[PDB]
Design a protein around this motif. Structure first.
Motif, PDB file in Angstrom:
ATOM      1  N   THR A  84      55.898 -40.301 -16.281  1.00 19.60           N
ATOM      2  CA  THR A  84      57.468 -40.293 -15.259  1.00 19.60           C
ATOM      3  C   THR A  84      58.526 -40.835 -16.141  1.00 19.60           C
ATOM      4  O   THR A  84      59.403 -40.543 -16.337  1.00 19.60           O
ATOM      5  CB  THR A  84      56.876 -40.490 -14.184  1.00 19.60           C
ATOM      6  N   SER A 129      61.714 -49.494 -13.910  1.00 16.89           N
ATOM      7  CA  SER A 129      61.863 -49.892 -12.853  1.00 16.89           C
ATOM      8  C   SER A 129      60.503 -49.266 -12.160  1.00 16.89           C
ATOM      9  O   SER A 129      60.733 -48.522 -11.333  1.00 16.89           O
ATOM     10  CB  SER A 129      62.920 -49.058 -11.660  1.00 16.89           C
ATOM     11  N   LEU A 152      57.802 -51.011 -10.000  1.00 20.18           N
ATOM     12  CA  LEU A 152      57.299 -51.683  -9.083  1.00 20.18           C
ATOM     13  C   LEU A 152      56.101 -52.512  -8.942  1.00 20.18           C
ATOM     14  O   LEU A 152      55.681 -53.399  -9.439  1.00 20.18           O
ATOM     15  CB  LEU A 152      57.896 -51.010  -7.412  1.00 20.18           C
ATOM     16  N   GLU A 153      55.033 -51.535  -8.649  1.00 23.99           N
ATOM     17  CA  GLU A 153      53.674 -52.005  -9.438  1.00 23.99           C
ATOM     18  C   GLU A 153      52.893 -51.547 -10.189  1.00 23.99           C
ATOM     19  O   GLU A 153      52.689 -51.313 -11.300  1.00 23.99           O
ATOM     20  CB  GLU A 153      53.355 -52.346  -8.043  1.00 23.99           C
ATOM     21  N   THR A 154      52.930 -49.524  -9.610  1.00 19.74           N
ATOM     22  CA  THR A 154      52.764 -48.944 -10.341  1.00 19.74           C
ATOM     23  C   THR A 154      53.535 -47.968 -10.589  1.00 19.74           C
ATOM     24  O   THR A 154      54.159 -47.432 -12.334  1.00 19.74           O
ATOM     25  CB  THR A 154      51.249 -48.172 -10.058  1.00 19.74           C
ATOM     26  N   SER A 155      53.978 -47.518  -9.616  1.00 23.31           N
ATOM     27  CA  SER A 155      55.376 -46.607  -9.653  1.00 23.31           C
ATOM     28  C   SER A 155      55.663 -45.715 -10.076  1.00 23.31           C
ATOM     29  O   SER A 155      56.633 -45.711 -11.516  1.00 23.31           O
ATOM     30  CB  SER A 155      56.290 -46.778  -9.490  1.00 23.31           C
ATOM     31  N   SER A 156      55.173 -44.582  -9.923  1.00 23.12           N
ATOM     32  CA  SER A 156      55.429 -43.436 -10.866  1.00 23.12           C
ATOM     33  C   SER A 156      55.048 -43.594 -12.240  1.00 23.12           C
ATOM     34  O   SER A 156      56.065 -43.997 -13.472  1.00 23.12           O
ATOM     35  CB  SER A 156      56.332 -42.477 -10.510  1.00 23.12           C
ATOM     36  N   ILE A 157      53.578 -43.990 -12.844  1.00 27.59           N
ATOM     37  CA  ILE A 157      53.592 -44.607 -14.129  1.00 27.59           C
ATOM     38  C   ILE A 157      53.980 -43.443 -15.335  1.00 27.59           C
ATOM     39  O   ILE A 157      54.370 -42.273 -15.147  1.00 27.59           O
ATOM     40  CB  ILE A 157      51.987 -44.856 -14.280  1.00 27.59           C
TER      41      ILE A 157
END
Lengths: 104, 182, 173, 156, 111
Positions: B120, B110, B112-117
């Motif tokens: 993670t 999931s 979003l744009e970067t969002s815990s790349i």
């Protein structure tokens, strides 16, 4: 043609087999009112009391929600009407659909 | 002779005659058919008319809460696996790997744009892997260990775990469960 | 105090009629939703049944239209007994739809493709090695109108070019 | 907005169709204006809106169909004027006129085809006009242009 | 109804609701630190699920209720006419198959 002369029983009973295939279409017709009219009776009884609860809104909560202000006072309507010269003079798109129109 | 031609007379004449009469009455029947069908779907305009009301902010609330407990997982700290399934219900049964390990990898997916790349997404997929290993022991307990459960405990508990797939790992856990004697 | 009754009974009205009637339309109009799909696809295939009223109660009424077109002909005013095509034309276009049941089954075309009006039977005869009495490979038995196709359809799962132990029926023994 | 409908005929593109962000507020504003009973008024206004917009897009395709540019070349001589596409987008915006207009209803409403008369009876007069125009450039001489009339027949 | 599914995480595709998935988590929390500073904006997105959720909740039970009357009433009368039309179809193959085997029986007498 050269030997097929008895074609009435076979092409016509094959047409009666097609009518037996159309008897399977009568199974699609008894199946048609069966499945479709089964959805009719099932959704019908399934949502008749939904019209009794939507009717409980639409009869009791309707005129109950109308006669909330059966008596209601004189100054308060000037107060919150003036607060609808606050909110009604915010435009439509700020306020929103049943926000604006329901304040109307 | 005219016994055979009497079959031509009664059979051909009556067959053609009542064929046209009965098929024309059948055309009147088809007129009643499209009559009731037209009044039927015309009455079924209120179906779609009421059916626009599928207000899927429910989907935004199970999805927003899915983002919420997803972020509880995505703190590397989603220890909310109530033991270990949760027992006898987490959707209706063992769903700690169903709604959540598939959210450990699919919510590792999931982005979003970067969002815990992708630092993670890997260890979140290792929560999908730990809950996947316990899931393997879970459906292994469901059907491979029982192996006596003729009821839903093999059937609708692994089939309650049928959001997880790959049931020939369970057949692998039938040459290691039921043909383990073999 | 009547305004307190507006808070109680009217918070019951908006909150409880909206939440309870939200359950009535949610669950009960969810049953109207899925059952609306049931009468929806039932309306679609019901329109296909109305198409079957054209595909059978008009097509066999087209057969009846030729029928009462022949009793409407009635041209004896006995040799006008060829009142059917569907004695030949739709009977060997229905039996050439047994060249389409043949051509589907293939079931010649492969290279005989002559006359299987009644491609009269097919069987599943797992053949026997006639000398030793042991079994041979299996064979579909394709008994056409006037030619035989004792075809090993193994592993020829078609029925396009299967193993044709074939001959004509006029000297088949 | 206006546009050449030929651009939706050249590229064959689907015609404009308003959608539910409006339409919920639109029909809401309508029956809302049947509590207020002025949905007839804003209805006639709306006949104004889309009727004039068909005069805008169909003001683009006034150009290549007022003038049948093949007068007497052979006589006829190409089969190739633009009253065809004129009548094409005329009927297709009559179509999304029909749908998109007659969508927005609490279902039983009287004046829905009467709305369609209010919008299209002037456009009936528009086709009657340009029907007049090609009716007179294809006039005064059989084989003027006399075969080409049959495409007019097509259009009518 | 139409809820209480697994849904995790179907259409991974974080949907960027107020772009709060984009702003806190995907622009200040890019490399897995945060979501702890962004988890506060996630609970704030849950309060926004109570204000956005209350906002849509007001419009949820708002369109009501006049009438879908002949949905039920024409479901009843059209269901009874559906029963009579089903009697016309069973009657249709009744007399129709009666004639089919009748003149296929006299046509079997032509056989």
């Amino acid at each position: 043609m050269p030997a097929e002369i008895d074609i009435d029983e076979a092409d016509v009973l094959v047409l009666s087999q097609e009518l037996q295939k159309t008897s399977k279409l009568t199974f699609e017709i008894n199946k048609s009112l069966k499945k479709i009219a089964a959805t009719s009776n099932q959704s019908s009884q399934l949502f008749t009391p939904i019209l009794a609860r939507n009717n409980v809104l639409t009869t009791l909560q309707r005129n109950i929600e109308s006669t909330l202000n059966s008596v209601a006072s004189v100054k308060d309507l000037a107060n919150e009407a003036s607060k609808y010269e606050i909110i009604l003079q915010k435009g439509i798109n700020q306020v929103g659909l049943k926000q604006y129109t329901q304040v109307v | 002779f005219s016994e055979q031609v009497a079959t031509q007379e009664v059979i051909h004449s009556e067959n053609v005659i009542k064929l046209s009469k009965d098929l024309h009455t059948t055309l009147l029947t088809f007129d009643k058919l499209d009559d009731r069908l037209t009044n039927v779907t015309q009455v079924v305009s209120p179906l779609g008319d009421k059916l626009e009301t599928a207000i899927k902010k429910k989907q935004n609330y199970i999805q927003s809460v899915e983002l919420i407990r997803r972020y509880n997982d995505f703190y590397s700290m989603g220890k909310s696996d109530i033991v270990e399934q949760l027992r006898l219900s987490k959707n209706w049964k063992l769903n700690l790997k169903s709604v959540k390990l598939m959210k450990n990898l699919l919510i590792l997916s999931s982005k979003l744009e970067t969002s815990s790349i992708p630092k993670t997404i890997n260890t979140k997929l290792v929560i999908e892997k730990y809950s996947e290993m316990m899931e393997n022991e879970l459906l292994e307990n469901f059907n491979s260990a029982y192996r006596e459960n003729n009821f839903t405990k093999l059937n609708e508990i692994a089939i309650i775990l049928n959001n997880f797939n790959g049931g020939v790992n369970v057949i692998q856990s039938f040459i290691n469960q039921h043909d383990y004697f073999i | 105090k009547f305004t307190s009754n507006l808070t109680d009974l009217s918070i019951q009205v908006q909150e409880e009629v909206k939440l309870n009637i939200n359950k009535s339309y949610n669950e009960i109009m969810t049953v109207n939703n899925d059952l609306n799909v049931a009468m929806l696809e039932l309306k679609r295939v019901r329109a296909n049944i109305n198409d079957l009223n054209e595909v059978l109660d008009q097509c066999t009424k087209i057969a009846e239209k030729r029928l009462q077109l022949q009793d409407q002909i009635d041209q004896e005013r006995m040799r006008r007994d060829r009142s059917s095509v569907l004695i030949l034309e739709k009977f060997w276009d229905t039996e050439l739809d047994q060249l389409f049941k043949n051509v589907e089954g293939a079931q010649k075309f492969i290279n005989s493709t002559k006359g299987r009006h009644i491609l009269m039977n097919s069987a599943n005869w797992m053949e026997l090695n006639t000398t030793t009495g042991k079994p041979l490979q299996m064979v579909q038995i394709f008994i056409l109108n006037d030619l035989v196709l004792i075809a090993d359809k193994s592993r020829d799962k078609q029925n396009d070019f299967i193993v044709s132990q074939c001959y004509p029926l006029k000297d088949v023994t | 907005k206006p546009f050449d409908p030929q651009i939706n005929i050249t590229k064959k593109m689907p015609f404009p169709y308003y959608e539910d962000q409006q339409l919920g507020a639109l029909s809401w504003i309508l029956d809302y204006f049947h509590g207020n009973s002025e949905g007839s008024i804003i209805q006639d206004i709306l006949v104004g809106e889309r009727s004039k917009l068909i005069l805008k897009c169909m003001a683009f395709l006034e150009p290549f169909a007022k003038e049948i540019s093949t007068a007497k070349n052979a006589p006829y001589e190409k089969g190739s004027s633009g009253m065809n596409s004129y009548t094409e987008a005329l009927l297709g915006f009559i179509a999304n006129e029909k749908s998109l207009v007659d969508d927005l209803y609490s279902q039983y409403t009287e004046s829905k085809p009467h709305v369609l008369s209010q919008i299209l009876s002037p456009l009936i007069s528009a086709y009657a006009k340009l029907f007049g125009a090609n009716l007179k450039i294809v006039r005064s001489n059989l084989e003027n242009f006399g075969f080409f009339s049959f495409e007019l027949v097509e259009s009518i | 109804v139409k809820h209480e599914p697994a849904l995790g995480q179907n259409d991974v595709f974080d949907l960027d609701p107020l772009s709060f998935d984009k702003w806190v988590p995907f622009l200040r929390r890019a490399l897995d630190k945060n979501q702890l500073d962004p988890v506060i904006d996630e609970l704030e997105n849950s309060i926004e699920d109570n204000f956005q959720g209350l906002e849509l909740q007001l419009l949820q039970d708002s369109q009501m209720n006049d009438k879908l009357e002949t949905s039920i009433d024409e479901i009843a009368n059209i269901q009874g006419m559906v029963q009579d039309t089903l009697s016309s179809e069973i009657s249709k193959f009744q007399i129709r198959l009666s004639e089919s085997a009748n003149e296929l029986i006299v046509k079997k007498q032509m056989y």
